Each structure stands twice: as structure tokens, then as C-alpha cells.
Amino acid sequence: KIETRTEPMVINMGPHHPSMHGVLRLMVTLDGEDVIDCEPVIGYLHRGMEKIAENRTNIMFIPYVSRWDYAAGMFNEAVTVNAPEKLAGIPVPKRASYIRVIMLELNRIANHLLWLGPFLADVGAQTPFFYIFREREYIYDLFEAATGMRFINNNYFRIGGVAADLTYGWVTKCRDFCDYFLPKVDEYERLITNNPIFVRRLQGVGKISREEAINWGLSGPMLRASGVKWDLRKV
Amino acid sequence: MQLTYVLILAALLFCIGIYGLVTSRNAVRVLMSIELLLNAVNLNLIGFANYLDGQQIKGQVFAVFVITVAAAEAAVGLAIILAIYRNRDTVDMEKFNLLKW
Amino acid sequence: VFVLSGYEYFLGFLIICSLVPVLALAASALLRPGAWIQFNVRYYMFALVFVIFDVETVFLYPWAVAFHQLGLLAFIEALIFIAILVVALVYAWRKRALEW
Amino acid sequence: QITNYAKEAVQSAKYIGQGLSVTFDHMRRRPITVQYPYEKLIPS
Amino acid sequence: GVYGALAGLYLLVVPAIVYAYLNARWYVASSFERAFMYFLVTFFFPGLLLLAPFINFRPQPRSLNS
Amino acid sequence: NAGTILPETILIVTLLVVLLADLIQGRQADRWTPYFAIVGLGGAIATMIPLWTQPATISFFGSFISDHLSLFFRGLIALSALGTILMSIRYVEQTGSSLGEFMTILLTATVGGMFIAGAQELVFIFVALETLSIASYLLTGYTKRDSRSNEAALKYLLIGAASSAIFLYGSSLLYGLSGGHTQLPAIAQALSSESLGLVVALVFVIAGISFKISAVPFHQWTPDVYEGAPTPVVAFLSVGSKAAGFALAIRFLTLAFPSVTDQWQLIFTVLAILSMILGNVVALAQTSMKRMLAYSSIGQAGFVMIGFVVGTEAGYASMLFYLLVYLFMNLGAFTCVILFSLRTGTDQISEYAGLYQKDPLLTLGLSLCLLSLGGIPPLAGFFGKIYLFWAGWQAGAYGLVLLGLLTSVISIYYYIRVVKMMVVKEPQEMSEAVRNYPEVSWSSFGLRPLQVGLVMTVIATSLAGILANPLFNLVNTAVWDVP
Amino acid sequence: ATLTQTITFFALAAAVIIAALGVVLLDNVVYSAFLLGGVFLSIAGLYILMNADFVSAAQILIYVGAVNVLILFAIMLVNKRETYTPVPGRWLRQGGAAVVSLGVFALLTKMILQTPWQLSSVPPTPDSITTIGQHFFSDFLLPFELASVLLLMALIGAVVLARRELVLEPEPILGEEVVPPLELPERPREP
Amino acid sequence: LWLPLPMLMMLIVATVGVLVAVWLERKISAAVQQRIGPEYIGPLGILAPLADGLKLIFKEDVLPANSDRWLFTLGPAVVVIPVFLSYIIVPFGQNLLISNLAMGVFLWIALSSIAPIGLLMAGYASNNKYSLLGGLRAAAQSISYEIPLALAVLAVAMMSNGLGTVEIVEQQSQYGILSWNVWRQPIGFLVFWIAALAECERLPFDLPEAEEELVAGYQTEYAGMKFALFYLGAYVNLVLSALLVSVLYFGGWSFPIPLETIANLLGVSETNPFLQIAFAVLGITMTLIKAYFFVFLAILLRWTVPRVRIDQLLDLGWKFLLPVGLVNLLLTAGL
Numbered sequence A: 001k002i003e004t005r006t007e008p009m010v011i012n013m014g015p016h017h018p019s020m021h022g023v024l025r026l027m028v029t030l031d032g033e034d035v036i037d038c039e040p041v042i043g044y045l046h047r048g049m050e051k052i053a054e055n056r057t058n059i060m061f062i063p064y065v066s067r068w069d070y071a072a073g074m075f076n077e078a079v080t081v082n083a084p085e086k087l088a089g090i091p092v093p094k095r096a097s098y099i100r101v102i103m104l105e106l107n108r109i110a111n112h113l114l115w116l117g118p119f120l121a122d123v124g125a126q127t128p129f130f131y132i133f134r135e136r137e138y139i140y141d142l143f144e145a146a147t148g149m150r151f152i153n154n155n156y157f158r159i160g161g162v163a164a165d166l167t168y169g170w171v172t173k174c175r176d177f178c179d180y181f182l183p184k185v186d187e188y189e190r191l192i193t194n195n196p197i198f199v200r201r202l203q204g205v206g207k208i209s210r211e212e213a214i215n216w217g218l219s220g221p222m223l224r225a226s227g228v229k230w231d232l233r234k235v
Numbered sequence B: 001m002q003l004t005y006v007l008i009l010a011a012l013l014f015c016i017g018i019y020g021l022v023t024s025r026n027a028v029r030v031l032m033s034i035e036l037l038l039n040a041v042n043l044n045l046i047g048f049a050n051y052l053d054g055q056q057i058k059g060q061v062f063a064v065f066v067i068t069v070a071a072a073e074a075a076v077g078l079a080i081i082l083a084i085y086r087n088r089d090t091v092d093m094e095k096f097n098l099l100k101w
Numbered sequence C: 001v002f003v004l005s006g007y008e009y010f011l012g013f014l015i016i017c018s019l020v021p022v023l024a025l026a027a028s029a030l031l032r033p034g035a036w037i038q039f040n041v042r043y044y045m046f047a048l049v050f051v052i053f054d055v056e057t058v059f060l061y062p063w064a065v066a067f068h069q070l071g072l073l074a075f076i077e078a079l080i081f082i083a084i085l086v087v088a089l090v091y092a093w094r095k096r097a098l099e100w
Numbered sequence D: 001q002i003t004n005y006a007k008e009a010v011q012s013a014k015y016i017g018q019g020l021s022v023t024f025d026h027m028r029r030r031p032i033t034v035q036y037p038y039e040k041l042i043p044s
Numbered sequence E: 001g002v003y004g005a006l007a008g009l010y011l012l013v014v015p016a017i018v019y020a021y022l023n024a025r026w027y028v029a030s031s032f033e034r035a036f037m038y039f040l041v042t043f044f045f046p047g048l049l050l051l052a053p054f055i056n057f058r059p060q061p062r063s064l065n066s
Numbered sequence F: 001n002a003g004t005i006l007p008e009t010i011l012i013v014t015l016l017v018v019l020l021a022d023l024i025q026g027r028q029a030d031r032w033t034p035y036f037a038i039v040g041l042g043g044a045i046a047t048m049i050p051l052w053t054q055p056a057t058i059s060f061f062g063s064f065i066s067d068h069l070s071l072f073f074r075g076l077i078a079l080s081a082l083g084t085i086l087m088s089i090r091y092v093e094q095t096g097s098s099l100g101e102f103m104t105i106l107l108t109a110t111v112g113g114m115f116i117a118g119a120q121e122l123v124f125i126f127v128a129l130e131t132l133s134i135a136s137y138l139l140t141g142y143t144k145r146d147s148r149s150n151e152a153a154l155k156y157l158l159i160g161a162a163s164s165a166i167f168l169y170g171s172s173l174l175y176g177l178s179g180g181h182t183q184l185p186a187i188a189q190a191l192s193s194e195s196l197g198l199v200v201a202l203v204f205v206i207a208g209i210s211f212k213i214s215a216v217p218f219h220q221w222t223p224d225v226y227e228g229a230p231t232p233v234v235a236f237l238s239v240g241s242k243a244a245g246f247a248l249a250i251r252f253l254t255l256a257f258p259s260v261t262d263q264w265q266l267i268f269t270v271l272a273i274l275s276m277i278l279g280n281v282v283a284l285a286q287t288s289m290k291r292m293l294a295y296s297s298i299g300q301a302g303f304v305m306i307g308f309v310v311g312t313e314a315g316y317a318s319m320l321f322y323l324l325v326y327l328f329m330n331l332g333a334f335t336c337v338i339l340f341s342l343r344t345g346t347d348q349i350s351e352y353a354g355l356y357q358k359d360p361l362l363t364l365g366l367s368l369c370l371l372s373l374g375g376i377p378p379l380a381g382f383f384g385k386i387y388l389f390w391a392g393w394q395a396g397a398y399g400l401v402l403l404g405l406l407t408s409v410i411s412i413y414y415y416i417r418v419v420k421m422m423v424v425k426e427p428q429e430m431s432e433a434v435r436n437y438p439e440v441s442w443s444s445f446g447l448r449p450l451q452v453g454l455v456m457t458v459i460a461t462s463l464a465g466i467l468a469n470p471l472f473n474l475v476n477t478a479v480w481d482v483p
Numbered sequence G: 001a002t003l004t005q006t007i008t009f010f011a012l013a014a015a016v017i018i019a020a021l022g023v024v025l026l027d028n029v030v031y032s033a034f035l036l037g038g039v040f041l042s043i044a045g046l047y048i049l050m051n052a053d054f055v056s057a058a059q060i061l062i063y064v065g066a067v068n069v070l071i072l073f074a075i076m077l078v079n080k081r082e083t084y085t086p087v088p089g090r091w092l093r094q095g096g097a098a099v100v101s102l103g104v105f106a107l108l109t110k111m112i113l114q115t116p117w118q119l120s121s122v123p124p125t126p127d128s129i130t131t132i133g134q135h136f137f138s139d140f141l142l143p144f145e146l147a148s149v150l151l152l153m154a155l156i157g158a159v160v161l162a163r164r165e166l167v168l169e170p171e172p173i174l175g176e177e178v179v180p181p182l183e184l185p186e187r188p189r190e191p
Numbered sequence H: 001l002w003l004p005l006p007m008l009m010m011l012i013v014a015t016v017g018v019l020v021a022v023w024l025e026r027k028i029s030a031a032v033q034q035r036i037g038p039e040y041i042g043p044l045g046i047l048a049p050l051a052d053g054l055k056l057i058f059k060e061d062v063l064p065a066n067s068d069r070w071l072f073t074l075g076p077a078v079v080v081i082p083v084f085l086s087y088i089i090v091p092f093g094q095n096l097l098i099s100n101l102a103m104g105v106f107l108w109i110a111l112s113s114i115a116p117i118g119l120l121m122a123g124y125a126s127n128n129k130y131s132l133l134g135g136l137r138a139a140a141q142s143i144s145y146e147i148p149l150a151l152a153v154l155a156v157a158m159m160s161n162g163l164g165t166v167e168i169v170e171q172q173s174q175y176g177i178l179s180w181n182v183w184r185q186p187i188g189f190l191v192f193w194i195a196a197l198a199e200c201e202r203l204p205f206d207l208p209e210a211e212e213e214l215v216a217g218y219q220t221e222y223a224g225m226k227f228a229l230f231y232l233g234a235y236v237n238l239v240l241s242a243l244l245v246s247v248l249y250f251g252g253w254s255f256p257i258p259l260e261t262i263a264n265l266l267g268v269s270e271t272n273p274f275l276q277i278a279f280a281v282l283g284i285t286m287t288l289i290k291a292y293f294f295v296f297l298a299i300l301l302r303w304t305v306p307r308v309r310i311d312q313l314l315d316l317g318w319k320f321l322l323p324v325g326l327v328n329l330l331l332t333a334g335l
Helices: A049-055 A074-081 A094-122 A127-146 A171-177 A182-192 A210-215 B003-023 B029-050 B059-087 C008-027 C043-065 C073-094 D017-023 E007-024 E033-041 F011-024 F033-046 F068-095 F100-114 F122-140 F149-177 F184-188 F196-203 F206-212 F231-237 F240-253 F264-280 F289-310 F313-343 F360-374 F380-392 F400-423 F447-462 F468-476 G003-020 G029-034 G036-049 G053-076 G097-114 G142-160 H005-013 H016-031 H048-057 H069-073 H081-088 H105-111 H115-123 H129-142 H147-160 H165-170 H189-200 H225-231 H235-248 H273-280 H287-300 H310-332
Strands: A003-005 A009-012 A026-031 A034-040 C036-038
Touching (some): A009 C036, A074 A094, A127 A171, B003 F149, B029 G029, B029 G053, B059 C043, B059 F122, B059 F149, C008 H225, C043 C073, C043 G053, C043 H310, C073 F011, C073 H310, F011 F033, F011 F100, F011 G142, F033 F100, F068 F240, F100 F122, F100 F231, F100 F240, F100 G142, F122 F206, F196 F264, F231 F240, F240 F289, F240 F313, F289 F380, F313 F380, F360 F447, F380 F447, G003 G036, G029 G053, G053 H115, G053 H129, H016 H048, H016 H235, H069 H115, H081 H105, H129 H189, H129 H310, H147 H310, H165 H235, H235 H287
Antiparallel strands (some): A009 A026
């Protein structure tokens, strides 16, 4: 039975975790309303990936790699084939170089579309969650054309370039999507920037300065929102 | 049901409230046992209003003010217990005998 | 004597709606196979402001029903009751009582 | 006071009115859904 | 309560007309017809609940002309 | 017809103005808001002098009377809260509490007791008794971190709300013995039979009447409230919450029960012959000054009932005047306990020893208010007790005055014991203030209201007996409206 | 049609006195606190039987909906899981309270029966929300205005006795000699 | 066994009134996300309220390990009995009333006060930490939105000279649509409608825990038939609160002469057998045309506003809805 004590109450966030970013376990402790300590218990999905890679060839490993960043997919196959193509000096054909850039930029659009769905549900509006997966199935069917799977498990990046070239009605099918989707990026920006309740949930909430966000070791849009302007594509 | 049977109901509902007022060891159960006394003076009061002076109810008006006093006496009454529980971390009426003599 | 009219169906409907859970939970009974809350005094404080304002509502219901048969002097007198218990409401906001 | 609660509330009493007619106009559109056992989607 | 004269006008004969109306114009109906469509179901619901497992809205089998 | 509750609705306006200044300005308002309550209470006294000459109207459709006695007891209860705000302006401001929230409860218990003294219906007595009693539980546990006021707030609630349930059970039967008739003059024409229902209706109401005045089978809360509560609250619960209980005992037992009258002159005798005993002999073995002054006021409530049970025109006039001079003694005794408790901590007897060379305004002050309570001449409490025993000896009651005299000698022993340990102890026998008195200033916040609160009571203690012929005519003229 | 007003009286009069023994004698206080709503609802059932339709509907709102919710919050705030069960604390003074409570009950029943009440055979309640509201603003006006003063004081007092001292708990305000914050300056001391 | 005919005919339209509101929730909320909704059961989803509730009976309603037994079972039976008893008020139809109580919009606010105890004896008894945190929060939300809702009814009882719910809707039957109370109380109706939506609807409720201040609310450890009373007993109050909107403000059973063209939400011809039954049942039930517009509104308003947190949920009821509830009552009086 439960008692009402004056100690700081510690609650367990649970590894059940009904959300769309996996399984954490936060033993956060409360002091009435403000939390005072929080430990992340991670490792619930450690399938032994660095021990697999010591007993695989490269072309046996590219199906394994699109499961680390499984929101993205072929962002992880880019690093794996770039381990010996940047080491054995295998030259990449320039058409494959521009083919990779199309896939890696289509993944980053599908990456930020999986973050945005659950994030807008966490901070408020719950009905734009279903109108965002509707925009994600257009990127899936474009990957489904060139590669044989939707978002992960597409052995598409090779050590010598890319696996195979695109389909036929493909470049005119981005130009439908990637000129329809760009009016909607300006639509999601007006949900949070306007409507002065959501900026009363995000102004000053989880702040970090520049010098500690470089010291803690941060990259991507956690680092660039700390005023750093370090992007590895330009660097 | 006549007038007499409401009064012996009210006179019995009073004396269970008395028995809780004196024997109870939780500091909050004395407050619930006080509220039994402030209902027995209501069950006496409406029952005096239905059979006596039925045309102009002077008892059911007086029955309204007893509820509002006892609701204001239990709002004050639990504020006191909640001031004690932050100092003395128990609620035990056999622990508040420090002003003895 | 019982000169209330309309309460003949209230005793029957009290039993039948009480027979909605006790029979359905029996109709299902034949077909089926570090513990701390913190002592935060806001659960009490939100409930105290209810009792002071659940009683104010009760006192205005004889006024609201029998208003247009009383007049203006019973509106000046019933305005003192509301205007004082507004000062009870401003006291609750300002002293951070109902803050949560 | 008595001259604020009917003018400090219309700032959001009309934001829902331009949020209701937006969401009510999603019901006019055609439901984009692929019913599985009766409309299977042709793979690539 | 009428025994069998006006009850069958509400329970059976008019809800059987709506189920013909529900099958035909449900996905192709306009923005004005759809809001009226939800009102007849929220009114004849103790009628439409009776003849519920007798009518199946599954699509008709195609002919495979190709 | 609402010109007769004008003394109280200057206090209800003053209740809100000293509250609204607390929310608007917020503890910078305590520099000026105590002096507005003084001109509200003094403004409440100043408008009864137009009402004293009015021919005693019965206003508010028979629910409130403005007789001469109801003008008198509404004067002492406003004056006791006038004397309390003069003390508490530094005391609770020294605790760290907000000063506007203290006076809003105290000027609600003041308006509670002003509405008991003139009430005439069985419901208006109970609500006015509740708002004096509800506000008295909040004041006794107002310091809220003391571990003594916490246990004194709860000892007052589980008896006060208990005795407010016994009092309601006698008010309800009194509505039931008569055929309705919740007004007090309408009761007495309806019941005259003196049956068993009237006696149970009589004892059940004087278990709540005689709880505010602390008669000795019901006295149990008073020595355990008075040493836990903050000391200005104690200064009001001994004068204000006793004049309010003594005003109810005359407005009830002379209006509701004139048929049964040989019995409540006999129950209040047993409350009189036993509160003089246990008020006075138990105050001997008390160390604390706030607990010595607790058993005094039980016993000083036993002297007032000597004028009550005799039932003469000189009887009730002798208990009205004794409360008039008892306000000039407890508010001058508790002023000096506060004034000693603010300078040094632990205000108890055998720590007063070694005064008279360090703060001799206190020692001259506290002496004339402790000596007058024991009834030595020529002070006010000698002339107050003489009119009691002149009233007791006039009509029977030869044994009530004699018990009031052998126990008026035991009362000398524990008042003198403070006066002994103030002026006779040599400068080699002082325990605190062994050069530890704070070198008196009267210049900080609110100390000058305390200095004027003590001098205008010591002057009103020593001179109230010599100049008693105004007050004897003000009090004897308030008694012709008592049947 | 009249015996169903007698059977529903004794079934409500036994609904209160078995719940009133439950709020007093039961070993757990939460089971004791929830049954207090059983007292307050069943008593409200009697007020309809005594032709008091407004006083019953005003009792479920205040006693069950406001007071009993106030009790239950004020018990979930104090559980602390430390009962310590010292039942033979000092003496058997729980049998001395059973004599005064049984003494008052036998005293009151002797008073109730033998006292001649003047019960009238007139029909009561001509719409008792209209004749209860013409009492609030003619006769019972000054208890109605004092109920407002009592309730405002009950909110000033119950807030300042239960709120958290998060403004300044370590506040040494001033001093002639030392006083702790929010405490009476008479420090405890034993002679 | 319910030998009263009006009492059985009301218990059916309080039972089919739930299955309308469950089905309307799964089709309106599926229209605004551009999907079908539950097909494949019944014709098009009509048996989705039957089959969702019938499977709750056939599950093992098992307790947790260390829980109170008499308060777990009595948990849901205190939430749902007063919202089922208070259907005795609503007089749908000109020639139908179950009981003419001399009050009843005051008996409804009296009986709706017992429901915070039912969320308390269920949040306590299920006996984990995240149901006391969720039970004390769910109880402290019906508290705050109850005084604004009781003052909206104070104003419409001032205009109506009574609390009898037939005498209220008889004052709006003299001019059809000119004398509905919405036109005379346009600021006390939104006080009713926001407070009633904040006591039974699914936007200001902590049961979907996508915000994770608790685990899944106070009905976390509940299963089976007990969970069906928390689920098919929430729409019983959504219908009754929407009925009392269309009884108090909008006139129950009040409307002008029906003799019009085909554009009156009906068929084509003037005098058909299909419009005579769309009139006569409307001459029996006129209010559940209006009462299923606010159920249509409350479902549609769920996807319109964002999920306001509990820190700002009680900063709406006390700090906004109650002062507007006061000044509406004075404006409904003279002042």
C-alpha cells in the first residue's frame, strides 16, 4: 500500500514507454513539481552490433547497418561502405556520387518527418500526427521504387558507388513530391512559431549554452541550435 | 415513520458521534465524529420542521446554516491537523499531551 | 403526509440504476475465465476553495429562484454576499493558494 | 474587471473559430486509405 | 407506445431504405450530403441496429476482363 | 431599520480595507494598516453614543435588538480588540507572520461577539457564536510552527466544535418544544410547563454558553489554550470571548427560560462555587505567567457569577460593572507580559526576578494590574468586588459571598508572588536581565502603540474605582432592559 | 402506498446507523472516510422523506461533494504507514466513554417519548425553495450576511495555517533577543 | 421488474444513446484524419459499439496483487450511478416526462458532485503510485469545473422563475427560435459548455498518457467489466451534458411549424410516409436532433484545441470560468 511521505518521490518512467523512439527507462525523482535527479537506464536494445561486425564481410554487413538509425535507413549504409572505399582508394563514379546525395537528402527529409510526428504530439497538437505520416509514405514509395524496401533494409549503397540506377518515372516523381512538400514545411513552422501556447512550452525549456554544448560532445541540430554552425557536409 | 422515530434516530446518531469524539485515536477520525453530531442536530431540526410549523419552515432554513457552519468548521478543522502533521509527523491524539499541567 | 410530487419514480429509478452495475458485474461473473506520494499541500488547497464556493452556490439558489418576486432591496442585500466572497476569490489567487 | 473578461477572451475565442473551420474542412476531403483485403497495393 | 403500427415505421421499413442509401452514396457524396448522412444514422440507430447482421457491404467480385 | 447594526458595519468595512491593503501592498502596508483598525474600532464605539439615547429598537424583523445592555457588551468586545491591536502590532510582526492576515481574523471574531450581545433568534445566536468560535481556533494556532500552538489549536477545536454541537442540540429542542418560533421572546410565551424536555433544553445550551466563560467543569481548554496561543490572542480570549459569553448568558436565560428559573440559578451556583475554588487553588502551583493568568480568568469568571445567580437589579448590574473593570486589568496584565516577552524570551515567573531597576514602567505597570485583580484598595478591582458582595448580600446568598472572600485571599498569594519577584529581589538574585535587558528604547516598530496601550490602562486601573460614579450610572442604566 | 414510506424510512435509518458505526469503530480510516458519504447520502434520503427537497439537494452538494472530498484529500495527505498500534496506551478509558454515550442516549429517549409535541395536521412545503428564499431576505437576513463574513474568514485562516512556507523559511527578521521564524517568542523552558 | 413503461423506455434511450456516441467518435475522428473508420463489422461500423463492449464482459476482470477489494469493485459503481440517475431530469418530448421534480437542474449538479469520490476510491484502491498521482489529479479536475457550471444554471434559473426542467423549456416555447436562452445568455452558455466539456470529454483528461506525467492515468490497473464502466460510462455523461445544453439554453422539444420544402433535413415530397415518421418520432424525440449536434461538436472540438496541461487546466476553471460565471449572474440580474 502507498504512503504519503515528505521525501522526494522517485518515479520510474518504465521501459514499456508508449512512444515512437524506443525503450528508455528514466528513474526520475520529483520534489513536488521540479525534478532533481534523473538517470537513464539504456541498453535495452543492445543486440551486439560491434561483435557481429568482426565476423562479417562488408557485403554481408550492409543489411545489418540500417538498424542503428532505423528512422533514417541509408544514412548508416553510407558510413559502412565509406569505411573501405575511403581506405582502399576505390574511386566512386560521379553519377553514383550525385545519386547518393539524392538518397541521403531524401532520408534527412524522412528523418525529420519521424521526429516531428511524436514531437508535436508531445507538446500539444495531436491531429497533425496523422497528416505527417501521410507525407512520409511519399518518401517510402520513392525508396520502394529504386530500392527494394521502404525505409530500412535496402542494400543500395556499395563500395564502388551505388547498387543500381533509378527507375524511369522517378525524377519527375520527386518533382511532384519535392515541389508539393515544400509548401508544407512552411505549414509546420506556423504551428509552433504562432499560437502563443506552444512557445509557452518551449521558451527556455531545456536550455544549454554554446561552450557546454561543445564540451558535452554534441552534433547536429542539438549543436546548431546552440549557435555553433558546425555542419559536417561543409566541414 | 412519525416525529418520534426521527428523534430517536437523531438521539442515537448523536451518541455514536460522542463515542467517536472521545475514543478515537486518529486525529482525523475525531473530525468525522464531530460531523455526526452536526447531522444529528440537522435530523432533529428538519423533523421538527415537517410536523411542527409546516407552513412556514423555520427549521429547514435553520437546517441550511448548520451545513454551512460545519463545512466551514471542517475546512478550518483540517487546516489545523495539516499544520500539526508538518511539525509532528504523526496524527495521534495520545501524542498531543505535552501541555499537561 | 408526503406532499412532494414527482418522487414516486425516484425510488424505483434509484434501485434499477443500482441494478445496472451489480447485475452486469454478476453477468460478467458467469462468462469470464519506494512507494511514496509526496506530501504536497495542493490537493487540500484546491479542495478548501471548493467548500467555500460550493456553499456560496447553495446560498444563491433560493435567491436565483425567488428573485423576480422579491425586488431590488433583496438584490442590494444579495450583492453584499457576492461582493464579499469575491474578496475571498482575489485572496486565493494573490496568496498563491490555487497555483498548482 | 468587468471591462476585461469579455475582451481578454476573444483573443482565443476566435482562434478556435479559425481552427474549427480548418479541421471541419478536412472532412470534405477524400479519405486516403488503402483497405487491405479489398484494395491491395501493387508492389514496385 | 404503439403496438405494431407506428413502431414498424421507425424500426424496420425506413431503416431498410437508409441502408440502400448508405451503400450507394457514401464515398461519392458531396460535402453537404455527408453531414445529413450522419444524422439519419444517429436517429434511426435502434432501427439500424436490428438489421445489422443481415446486410453486408463487402464489394462485389470483379470480372477480370484483362 | 438597519441603523442599529451601524457599529458592526463600520467594522465590516474596516475588515475589508485592512485585508485589501494586504493583497495590494503586501507587508509594506503594516506600517499604516494597524492604525486604520483603531479608528474603525474607535469609530464603532463613537457611534453608539448616538445610539445610547435611542429608545432600544428591535431591528431586522425581530432578529436583532439594540437595547441598553446590547450597547454595553458591544462596547467591551470592540474595546478588547482595540486593546489587542495595540499589543499585536509588534508581536506577530516579530514572528514573521503577515500582519494584515492576523487582524482580518481578529476583526471577525470582534464582529462575531458584537452580534451575540444583541441577537434575539436561535439561528443568529448560533452563527454569531460560530464566527467568534471559528476565528478563535485560527488565532490560537496562528503561529503554525511552534509545537505548542499546534497542540493548543487542536485542544480548542475538539472541545469548541464539540460544545457547539451540544449547544445546537439545545437550540434544536427549544425550537421543538415551542411550536416553531425561533425567536427568543416568542419562545417564552409558548413553553411554561417546566417538563423534562425544557430541562434537557436548558442544560444543553449552558454547556455552550458556559464554555466561552470557562466555568470549571467546562474550563479544561483554558489553561492549555492560553499557554499555546500567541499572547495578544490570549488577551482577547480572556476579556472579549468572556464578555461575549457573559452577554449570551443574560440574553438567553432571561429571555428563553424565565419559567424555569430556580434551576439555572442553581446550575450556575455550582459553576460559581467550584470555579472560585479550582481557579484559585490551582493557580498557586503554576510557573508560567500565561498559565497563571489562565487559572485566574477561570476564577475571575467565578466572581462574576455571584452577581448572576442572585437575580436582582443590583445583581446583574454588579456583573456588568465587574466586566467593565476586568477589561482594565487583563489588558494591562497581558500588555506587560507581551512587553516582557518581546524584550527577552521565556516570559515566565522566576524570570521576572530582578526587575524594578531596568524597566520600571513595566514593573509599576504589571503591579497595579496584578494587585487590582486580587482586589486590594484603592484600585479598580477592590471597588468591583465590593459591589459584587453588596449585591450578593442584598438578596440571600450568604455563602456565595463568603466563598468569594476566602478565595479572594488565596488570589492574593499568586498575584503577590509576581510582585514579590519583581520589586523585592535584590540585584544579586536576577536570572535573566543580568545586564541582559535590551536597554529599553520605545522607538522601534509598534512599541509606541504598546506604551500607550499600557499607560492608558494603568491610569484606567488605578482611577476607575475613585472615579466609579460615572461608570456606576452607565451600568445601572443598562439593566432596566433585563426582565 | 404508505407502507412503502415506512419501509424506506427504516431502510434509510439503518443505512445511517450502520454507517455511523462504521465511521467510528472501523479499523482503517480510509474505509471509515468513504462510509462517511454513506451517512451523508442516507441522511439526504431522509430529507426527501421529510418533505425537504432543497435541503437534501444542498446536502449531497456540500456534505458528500465538498466536505467528504475535503476529508479524503486530507487523509491521502497523511498516511505515513506508521500506526505503531499502542492500543493499551495507559488505561481502559474507552469503556468510560461508552457509559456517557450510552448515558446520553438513554437520557434523550426518556425525553423524546414522554414530551407532548403539538404536531399539526396541515399539508407542509408549498414549494419550499420559494418560502425558504423569502426567509433569507426578510427574517434570516443578518445570519445570511454573517455567513458571508464567516466564510471569508474561514478562507483567510485555513490558507495561512496550511500553506507552505516557501517565501522565507530561514528569516531572522530582527532582534532584541532571539525569536525563531513563525513562532511565538516565549521560548520553551522548564523551571 | 421495471413495470413502469416510461422508466424502461428511458433506459433504452440512455443505452442506445451511448452506442451512438461511441460510433460517432470512431467515424468523426476518422473523418478528420482522412481514413475510413471501423469498417468490416456491421455494415459500416454500426456494431463497433456493441462488439467493443461485449468483449469487455468476456475477459478475466482480475485484481492487482496487493489492493483493496471492496473499493476496487465499488470504484466504478460510484462514477456511473449518479450520471445514470440524473437522466430522470431530461424531458425529451412534449408528451413525455418521466418525473416532474420541483427541482432537477439543482439535483443534477448535486448528483454530479459524487463523481470525484468515485475517482478517489478507484485511484486509491488500485494501489500503485501512478494511480494515486492520477486519482488525486482526476479528482482535482471535477472540483474546479463545478462552480462555473453551477453558476451557468443559476443565470438560466433566474430567467425561468424555477428549477423544474419542464418550466425552463416551457419559457422558450412561445417564440420558437426567438426565445431560446442562447440569444439572451450568450456568455453563460460558453461557461456551461466549456465546463461541461472539462468534466467528461477527452481533450482535458490525463487518460492518454502521451505526456507521461503519470503512467496511464487512474484507470491503469482496471480491466474487463470494471473498465467498461469507466469507458462506456464516460459517454453516458457526454450525452447527458449535451442533452442539458439542448434543454437549458437551446429549447428542448421547441421548433416552429414543419410545413416546408424538401430542404428540412428530410426526403423530397411533402406528404410521404417517410416524413410522417420523421415528424412523429420528432413529435416524440425532438431533443436528440439537437443533443447529437453537441456530441458532434464535442468530438470535433477534441481535434481542434491542443492538449492543455493540468497546470493550465486549473488556471482556466478557477481563474477564468468562475469570475466570468459571477459577472454573468449579475448581468443576468439588473445591476
